[PDB]
A paper describes a structure:
The uncharacterized protein AMUC_1438 is encoded by a gene that was previously shown to be upregulated when the bacterium is grown on mucin. Here, we provide structural and functional support for the assignment of AMUC_1438 as a unique O-glycopeptidase with mucin-degrading capacity. Structural, kinetic, and mutagenic analyses point to a metzincin metalloprotease catalytic motif but with an active site that specifically recognizes a GalNAc residue α-linked to serine or threonine (i.e., the Tn-antigen). The enzyme catalyzes hydrolysis of the bond immediately N-terminal to the glycosylated residue.
We were unable to generate crystals of FL, but we were able to determine the structure of ALTL to 2.5 Å resolution. In this case, the last 18 amino acids in the two molecules in asymmetric unit were missing. The last ∼60 C-terminal amino acids that could be modeled, and which correspond to the missing residues in the ALT structure, comprised a three α-helix bundle resembling the Found In Various ARchitectures (FIVAR) domains observed as linkers in the ZmpB O-glycopeptidase from Clostridium perfringens. However, the relative orientations of the α-helical linker domain and the catalytic domain in the ALTL structure differ from the FL model, with the α-helical linker being packed more closely against the β-sandwich domain in ALTL than in the FL model. Indeed, the conformation observed in ALTL seems unlikely in the full-length enzyme as the position of the α-helical linker domain would likely result in clashes between the CBM-like domain, if it were present, and the rest of the protein. Toward providing support for the conformation observed in the FL model compared with the ALTL structure, we employed hydrogen-deuterium exchange mass spectrometry (HDX-MS) on both proteins. Most relevant to the FL model, however, is the increased exchange in the last two β-strands of the β-sandwich domain and the initial 1 to 2 turns of the first α-helix in the α-helical linker domain. In the ALTL crystal structure, these secondary structures are shielded from solvent by packing of the α-helical linker against the β-sandwich domain. In the FL model, however, the α-helical linker is peeled away from the β-sandwich domain, thus exposing the protein regions in FL that were observed to exchange more readily. Therefore, the HDX-MS results are consistent with conformation of the FL model.
Residue numbers in the entry:
A (entry chain B): 18 to 458
B (entry chain A): 19 to 458
Write the structure that this text describes.
């Protein structure tokens, strides 16, 4: 109900199973938080100007609207998914307005480039934050540069306890522009002024999600009337409902699950484990293993049943489908709850997929904000043929059992043994390339 | 021509539009019989700046770009039922695109989105004049070595003169259409192929504007043909090479308009003395109708009428403009014109709930100009005839004066219906929409 920053409505209804999974996740996380110190983390804002690039007019009031819009959006989307209205807290002054730290870089735009705008702007943010007693390497920071397109950075990266977002200011940029239907003039993108603000501010929400540790997650068959996933193509649809263009952008339940363990969102200062490590995808990862893991083929999808070997508290599980040759934008995800013994059961589909072999990512969300992730080769079709899945049990049973237990080198040896013993058989030789690919992620 | 990633044809024209195209070309061919041939070419100018040197391979890359757009227009004109008409390029002894190099002795810091356009065209005029070419009598594509947010992406002109504006980028080439790798680090999260689609499809879109084409969106009669190039097709040009969709197609109503452009048909027809610019792109002349009746059908109207031909015409185009929408939201239908001026077309807008909608009727003359009138019409899903019948009893004199171009008399007659029967329910809703049409 905050019209001062053009608060976005909720234009989708969560599926009942995801809301039930959200409640079970928050119940588990709340028990984990009992007795742990509270978090005072805030999302800090730095405004970077340059030698021939002074601060734009009203940037303090306009970005007070922008961040409050993103803050309300995340809270409202968290609440729509079944969680409490969790969101990041801002630094407010005595008047309740957004505190923005101003930084300057003594370099002209001619001396800047697409590859240097990022690090140079963050370097200026480090200095101005340290002067105020804030360590940039231990907080989440949004760096706003007064740079144009083709020079300035639109980027985001981080994890649960540290992250950095990058965006660029523009004259009159404000969430109030979301309603404008007038066309922009003279630009390569033949698009309205309202969508242009959607790209800017919706992009900022997309980069901030990246800074919290969220990779890309596209739309799925289970949400055909919810708009575009914010961490997918939703960055370009954020606020489209205010122009009656569509359903806008929604926070995917699998992304809501991951953020529920972020201290910036839940307010609890949990400690990261010692074995946390960065991976190919955004986030912090720890080793994990399963007691059993089977993907059963169904019509246009898979039914994933398994039992996690829980050596640490976990609150949920997320299954991804990654089509070969596609980017992370093309993946779809399904979430599920975990019982105390570690059993889970979910169904993930990709209707119309003709490629047959597809990669599946199974992520276990731990209460310490980290994740354990494994990549499994699976076969899928419209009919739901069981023949490839049966060859995976008969020939590749030892490979899977070792792989889901994290024994990569032993699984490779067992994979080499079936290739040398039965590699000439047609039903075996087609599983070898997708198994070798899965064993290297 | 795979050397420049020639685009395929990903749509099939409706049979009536192809039949309309053949009848239009037959009429235009008779008009061209005995007229001098045209040597017009679309000239290309590359503008560099003080701290903005020419990008690598810009000569070979824009040889691919212009040949791609040239082949696209030819293939889309042929798909619509016309001969493979397109613009001709200036080719050297090796058959490569001739590019005129222009320089502006100003740094990029002194350029802006609003000033890059006119400053670039001025530099193009000088280098073209040095070669004996008058920019105000030809079609020119101005390419600036400028980034986004500084450089111009614009287009404007008519049948006998036009200017297109675009900006170069590192590695911009139609061969990039197939790339599915993500760009990264940009405000627009799009693949490298999508980025090239926006650049080159934009150029094709601006060139269409330079030929005299306004915006024309998609319509119900082509739901599986892709996006209209003069609508949102600028962002779908070449999408089929990534299996993203059907790409961009040239709307039959736009193909009709281009058939009278000397750059496309090769005949140097003379512009009439009464040609004038209008609210929309193109050259316009006064026109009138002997009769004009819109018959309501399901989700649309059937338009029958007879143009009062005071000059040779080869076709007619009807547009529907929903209230509150931009030019991107209009849909258009083309039709052929007989020697007496008779025409018959059907235009629909399924799902439109607004009831009252504006219709633009454009007559395409053989001298490259158009006559256009704006009519208020009513439309619904059922196809109810009641509002159109009240439109016949009242406002009868208003339409008769309006289709004869007598604006002031139509306004006076409109005030008479408001004073005599303005309280009647079947009359009072036509009054506001008629004043809007009489002022458009
Ligand atoms: Na065996
Ligand atoms: Zn991203
Ligand atoms: Zn345009």
């Amino acid at each position: 109900r905050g019209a001062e920053f053009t608060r976005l409505p909720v234009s989708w209804t969560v599926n009942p199973r995801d809301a039930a999974n959200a409640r079970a996740a928050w119940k588990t996380l709340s028990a984990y938080h009992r007795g742990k110190p509270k978090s005072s983390r805030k999302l800090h804002v730095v405004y970077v100007t340059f030698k021939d690039r002074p601060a734009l007019e009203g940037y303090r009031e306009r970005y007070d609207h922008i961040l409050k819009n993103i803050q309300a959006y995340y809270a409202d989307q968290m609440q729509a998914n079944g969680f409490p209205p969790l969101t990041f807290q801002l630094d407010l002054d005595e008047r309740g307005k957004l505190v923005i730290h101003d930084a300057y870089v003594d370099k002209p735009m001619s001396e800047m480039s697409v590859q240097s705008s990022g690090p140079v702007s963050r370097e200026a943010a480090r200095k101005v934050l340290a002067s105020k007693g804030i360590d940039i390497e231990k907080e989440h920071v949004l760096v706003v540069c007064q740079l144009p397109d083709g020079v300035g950075p639109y980027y985001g990266g981080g994890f649960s306890h540290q992250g950095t977002g990058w965006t660029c200011d523009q004259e009159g940029l404000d969430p109030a522009s979301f309603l404008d239907t007038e066309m922009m003039q003279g630009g390569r993108f033949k698009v309205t002024r309202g969508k242009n603000a959607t790209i800017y501010i919706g992009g900022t929400a997309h980069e901030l999600g990246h800074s919290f540790g969220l990779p890309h997650t596209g739309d799925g068959w289970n949400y055909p009337d919810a708009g575009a996933s914010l961490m997918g193509h939703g960055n370009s649809t954020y606020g489209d409902e205010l122009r009656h263009e569509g359903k806008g952008a929604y926070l995917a339940p699998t992304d809501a699950l991951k953020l529920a363990s972020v201290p910036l969102f839940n307010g609890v200062e949990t400690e990261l484990p010692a074995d946390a490590s960065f991976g190919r995808m955004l986030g912090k990862y720890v080793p994990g293993s399963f007691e059993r893991l089977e993907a059963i083929p169904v019509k246009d999808g898979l039914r994933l049943k398994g039992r996690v070997h829980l050596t640490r508290p976990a609150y949920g599980i997320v299954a991804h489908l990654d089509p070969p040759g596609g980017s992370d934008y093309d993946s779809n995800a399904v979430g599920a709850s975990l019982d105390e013994k570690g059993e889970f059961d979910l169904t993930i589909c990709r209707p119309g997929y003709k490629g047959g072999f597809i990669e599946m990512r199974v992520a276990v969300l731990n209460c310490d904000s980290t994740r354990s992730m494994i990549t499994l080769p699976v076969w899928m079709d419209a009919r739901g043929t069981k023949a490839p899945s049966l060859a995976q049990i008969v020939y590749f049973g030892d490979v899977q059992n070792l792989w889901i237990r994290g024994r990569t080198e032993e699984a490779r040896k067992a994979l080499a043994e079936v290739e040398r013993r039965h590699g000439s058989r047609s039903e075996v030789k087609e599983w070898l390339p997708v198994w070798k690919r899965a064993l290297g992620r």
